[PDB]
Design a protein around this nucleic acid. Structure first.
Lengths: 94, 96, 109, 82, 96, 82, 109, 94
DNA sequence: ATCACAATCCCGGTGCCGAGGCCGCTCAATTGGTCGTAGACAGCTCTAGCACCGCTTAAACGCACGTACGGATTCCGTACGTGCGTTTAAGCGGTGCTAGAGCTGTCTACGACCAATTGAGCGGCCTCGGCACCGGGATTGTGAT
DNA sequence: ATCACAATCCCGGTGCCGAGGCCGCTCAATTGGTCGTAGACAGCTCTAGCACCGCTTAAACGCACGTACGGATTCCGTACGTGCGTTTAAGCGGTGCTAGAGCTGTCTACGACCAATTGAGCGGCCTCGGCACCGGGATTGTGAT
């Protein structure tokens, strides 16, 4: 049987940051893994169409940011843009 | 003096506007409304003429679609008059 | 002779995997090329949305006097938050149940 | 700076739209309710259309920007290029 | 002998089932229904156990969702009893 | 050859689903109407799920076939792998 | 020295362009590879659906006593055919209008 | 200005087959061009996901046929499958 | 109000299944050098978007009259809710069979790649003819007699 | 029934602009040869899906009683429909200005590619502990007095 990949080790690391004394069941972990895969394809699909509309062959951080503004509502989109911009700036500096 | 009974002219108007395809909102006040709304997103925007027309064709189609769902809600309550609670029920069931 | 490897996730200050997200972007037939900043931005957004749900779900578990988050807690977190309820509007959470809601005209007089 | 243009959507215009929808009788409170619903619909489409315009580094909203914005909201429009 | 008034037990049942998450259709007759329907598309089909369970979770969620829209239609007609015309109105507005 | 399994969706089962939906009072004609609606929903999902199964040259309907069929009908399901 | 060219559309007995459809499949980032039979099948399906709409729209134009098909005729063709109405259920036809339909309870007694 | 492509020359040839004495306005031709592009991306998108689900790197006639069965209702799907199968068979023979 | 009562919440003690923690290994992420090209940039053209002026009626607005529709009330009988005894059958645990899905190695059919060439498709003009506009003529359905 | 009347369909003449046909050209589809590799295929393994049996109560079903909700009727008064006079502003045609979008050529930063290397993540076990079950006490809201 081939190896199966998932986001469970990363979801658990985020959970320990926000709630250090709280666990999660295996069924709820399955919910979170499907949520991450769902949001990933939504963003990547919209970013793919944006590059196609503008006759570009590269998906950049500009296409990801526009796709986030199209897909997320209101205050969720504003904070997500701030988190993405901060991470790219820190990655660029070193 | 001749007078039509209430509802006779309204049924005539339904038969007038359902066989025709022209836009029913005046073009210049719709264009002013679009430009007013767009000011809150980006200042000094320009619009292609066909972009405003596409917005008007979509908006009239949405409103006509909502009024037929609204009319079914009023008839369900044994009424022939559409009311704001009919619009609110239709938008709730649609998920808007 | 070469420098010791240090992960792209740690370079960006993230918990979600930047290198894995970059691989999934390339093999998903989304575009011919994928820029360097794109998986960093996407991993940061996915991590942010995960932390928002887990914060509200952990609060629902504490309100139910439980240690462990279960799918009921995720459903209560999503449906009680207006923006998350809009984002996951066409999503069914298995074993999630519904919000308690009785129409006021059905109550006893 | 434009203001109060929602009243340009007149009562006879709303009535004509209701007639095409098959409506025979209209209460007097319908007209303010319809103006609110139209404003909500227009704000949602125009926000996404301007987002496509800003991504292209343009200053002019095109018909294709509107067509893409309507399509992603699940209301596909034929007749303007998409 | 003690008797609750009509509607008292029904309101108790609403509070019971809205606070819990278990499936409300018995598992074995649902499985027979799925296998019956699938015979018209391909003979001698097999089903994974989790495939039938995913179908049941989706079906119960769809029906619960339809019943809340149905309840709003009945209340709109100044009724507390849901009727087949309430279901038909909700499905028409939804576009089903 | 199975037959008449729709009557296994009993009247107490339909009532329990209505209670979770917040319904207080139920007319007697609801139960046959609900069985028809469920059969239509199930036929549409299962037809697409078997189509995914036949394309894979498989003889067993998997949970992933059901998840893909629900997703393409706009009814995304979390908890079974997608 | 080489044989004279003869189009893939004429090989398949089609009016829609097989070679153009193959190019659009290749540059659309749909997959890494595109088989030879795939644009033939796609062009045949698109040609079939076009012929069904134009047949019903031409009949609507003749019923309106008109020579030329206009967008009103396309809307009448689509909305009066159950399968086409299901296919294009979320589509707005510009300058198409609506079907004539008055609810029976609104008629005079 | 760069050249613009459309399906109008092919739509006109189909129209002359089914209605030899019937024309079409420029606005209605714009409708038909948007309809063909809409159905194209619907079929090609579903065919792309089908190949991804089954871990294949090639879109073949089999993926197009399955995508047609998923996307078209009832009798439209049955006749479209017959038209596609017949065209591939005649293409294969010569 | 008041009392009896049925349903539910809460507290506490055990058992147990499930989650968290740990190991090793192998697959995939990282590093470094190389090259190739996609995209940024400075400039130019020229297209169409914006702002303004002057009419010309089409459309909107306010108002009076009165029709008929929505809402409130009453009454009743029809349909459902509640509760109980009895029967049906679902859920569970174990046990064979075996159908079929995943995995391995190999070879071939098929699809990418590339260079010329020609023929198919698009942009630009020209002109028939289908459609639109106006002006009666005859119905055709509405409303009071 | 019947007569007056307002709106609408229909027929005809005719001008107009929109669609169809035709021509230059240039770009992309086709043909031919070469090679890389994705996938079909024959076979093996092993695992979970199906069929059967035997209990064990949980749930479903039919039935009786009685409550209260839905529907039918009546009345009224309130709010819209219809029509008319007056005012306003939308639509149209022309005319400047100029902002900006598309195109051209060049160059440079960025992204693919490929070979080693090591470390991060996954599958497999082990075992604390959070949760479920069951029994008892206290509320707690319902319903008749």
């Amino acid at each position: 049987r081939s190896r199966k990949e998932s986001y469970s080790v990363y979801v658990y690391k985020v959970l320990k940051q926000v709630h250090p004394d709280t666990g999660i069941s295996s069924k709820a972990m399955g919910i979170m893994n499907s949520f991450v895969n769902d949001i990933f394809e939504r963003i990547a699909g919209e970013a793919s169409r944006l590059a196609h509309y503008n006759k570009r062959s590269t998906i950049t951080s500009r296409e990801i940011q526009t796709a986030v503004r199209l897909l997320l509502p209101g205050e969720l989109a504003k904070h997500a843009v701030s988190e993405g911009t901060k991470a790219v700036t820190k990655y660029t500096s070193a | 003096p001749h007078r039509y009974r209430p509802g006779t002219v309204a049924l005539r108007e339904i038969r007038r506007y359902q066989k025709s395809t022209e836009l029913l909102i005046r073009k210049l006040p719709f264009q002013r409304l679009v430009r007013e709304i767009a000011q809150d997103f980006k200042t000094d925007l320009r619009f292609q003429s066909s972009a405003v027309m596409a917005l008007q064709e979509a908006c009239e189609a949405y409103l006509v679609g909502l009024f037929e769902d609204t009319n079914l809600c009023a008839i369900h309550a044994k009424r022939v008059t559409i009311m704001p609670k009919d619009i609110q029920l239709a938008r709730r069931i649609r998920g808007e | 002779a070469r420098a010791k490897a240090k992960s792209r996730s740690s370079r960006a200050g993230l918990q979600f995997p930047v290198g894995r997200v970059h691989r999934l972007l390339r093999k998903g037939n989304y575009s011919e090329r994928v820029g360097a900043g794109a998986p960093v931005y996407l991993a940061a957004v996915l991590e942010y949305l995960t932390a928002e749900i887990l914060e509200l779900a952990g609060n629902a578990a504490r309100d139910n006097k439980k240690t462990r988050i279960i799918p009921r807690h995720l459903q209560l977190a999503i449906r009680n938050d207006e923006e998350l309820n809009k984002l996951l509007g066409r999503v069914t959470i298995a074993q999630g149940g519904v919000l308690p809601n009785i129409q006021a005209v059905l109550l006893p007089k | 700076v434009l203001r109060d243009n929602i009243q340009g959507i007149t009562k006879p215009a709303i009535r004509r739209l209701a007639r095409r929808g098959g409506v025979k009788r209209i209460s007097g409170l319908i007209y303010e309710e319809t103006r609110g619903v139209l404003k909500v619909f227009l704000e949602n489409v125009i926000r996404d259309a301007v987002t496509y315009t800003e991504h292209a580094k343009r200053k002019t909203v095109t018909a294709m920007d509107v067509v893409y914005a309507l399509k992603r909201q699940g209301r596909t429009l034929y007749g303007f290029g998409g």
